[PDB]
Amino acid sequence: DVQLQESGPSLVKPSQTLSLTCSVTGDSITSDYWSWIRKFPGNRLEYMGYVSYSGSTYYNPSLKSRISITRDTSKNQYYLDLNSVTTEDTATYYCANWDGDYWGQGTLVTVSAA
Amino acid sequence: KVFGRCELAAAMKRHGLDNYRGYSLGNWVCAAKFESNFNTQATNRNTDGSTDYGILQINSRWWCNDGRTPGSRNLCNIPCSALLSSDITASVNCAKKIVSDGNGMNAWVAWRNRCKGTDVQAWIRGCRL
Amino acid sequence: DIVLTQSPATLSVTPGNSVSLSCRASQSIGNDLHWYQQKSHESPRLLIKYASQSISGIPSRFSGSGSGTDFTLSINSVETEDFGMYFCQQSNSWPYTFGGGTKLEIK
């Protein structure tokens, strides 16, 4: 069966690049479309984007070109890179397949000067 | 089951294909016409060992699993048999995922060769929707 | 982009009673409306897809209805395990968007 899990820093500084990894086990990353979704402290959910089989990407315009979603078939993982983060990017990040049947556990990332 | 043109147009509209990810309803009806001639049971064995299934001739190498295709990826996470039903639900769900890739409807060769660039709206004209 | 508005924002109910949650789109989205359940410290769980299609592994008491701009998620005889947040999400057009959520609590 399929399993997804997010990994990466839980604390980052303003202006830096937030980078998360989603490890997929149980099936190949070439067998689905992959997404990133985040939940803001106020219970607001935002669909950040997804990468489909051809490699084409779809990013939420709200991210003003700060986002990049890539894949690595050899490691069976896909990634999220969010540049120039601010306190507004503090949220719980989740990876899930496009169908929405498989989700990671989610990982909290806090953006603070401290 | 062999759908009538207007019958399928109404069904596809009910299944949400009337303007799905930038593609007007006529595109979908035209696609079905040239891919399967509106036949939900249509199958086509390909040279690479894959088979195209159903009303929208969905391929077993990339989209569905028929358990007999080399290099199968099952992008739609569905058995090809589910795409050979008189109920178009599964075919539409998969078609939507297919078109959600940057290649859009170019995934359908018949559509590309007989629909793209033509007056696709004509395929739903004269129909009670 | 498509805006999804959910109502009520919060709903209190006593286990055993039934409830219905609303989600309305700023413009027609056909049947591309899905429902998710989310509990504290947990990832969202897909309950219904494409307005009314059932999902394997989800309790039968959950059902969805609607098309166009008005959708509803119904829970026939709420159980304690049902308390939490419910979000609708549309996939008709990019960017996909989520409703603001409806909190279901015990009364």
Phi, psi (5° rounding) for residue B39?
A: -100, 110
In chain A the beta strands, taken as DSSP E runs, fall at: 3-7, 11-12, 18-25, 34-40, 44-51, 57-59, 67-72, 77-82, 91-97, 107-111
Close Cβ partners of A65 (under 8 Å, ≥ 6 residues apart) = A59
Query: Which residues in chain A have Cβ-Cβ distances shorter than 8 Å to C87?
Result: 45
> Strands B58-59 and C45-49: what pairing?
unpaired
CATH number for C93: 2.60.40.10
Joined tokens for residue B19: 């303007």
Rounded to whole angstroms, how far apart are CA atoms B49 and B59?
10
**Residue ranges covered by each domain of chain A:** 1-114
Identify the residue whose tokens are 């983060």: A85
| Structural domain for C90, as ranges | 1-107
**Beta strands A11-12; A107-111: pairing state:** parallel
Chains adjacent to C (≥3 CB pairs closer than 8 angstroms): A, B
Q: Are the C-beta atoms of residues B52 and B72 closer than 8 Å to each other?
A: no
Q: Which of residues 61-100 of A touch C (CB under 8 A)?
A: 61-62, 94, 96, 99-100
| Mutation target vs B (from C27, C31, C46; most B CBs, 10 A cutoff) | C31
B18–C67 C-beta distance less than 8 A? no
Could you tell me the domains of chain B?
Answer: 1-129 (1.10.530.10)
- Whole-angstrom Cα distance, residue C88 to residue C34? 5
Is residue B73 within 8 angstroms of chain A, CB to CB?
yes
Compute, in degrees rounded to 10, the torsion defined by CA atoms B120, C69, C29, B17: -40
What are the C-alpha distances in Å from C44 to residues A25, C21, C69, C83?
19, 17, 23, 13
Across the interface, of B74, B97, B103, the residue whose CB is closest to A54 is B103
The CATH superfamily holding the domain A1-114 is Immunoglobulins (2.60.40.10)
Total number of domains in chain C: 1
Name the method of structure determination.
Answer: X-ray
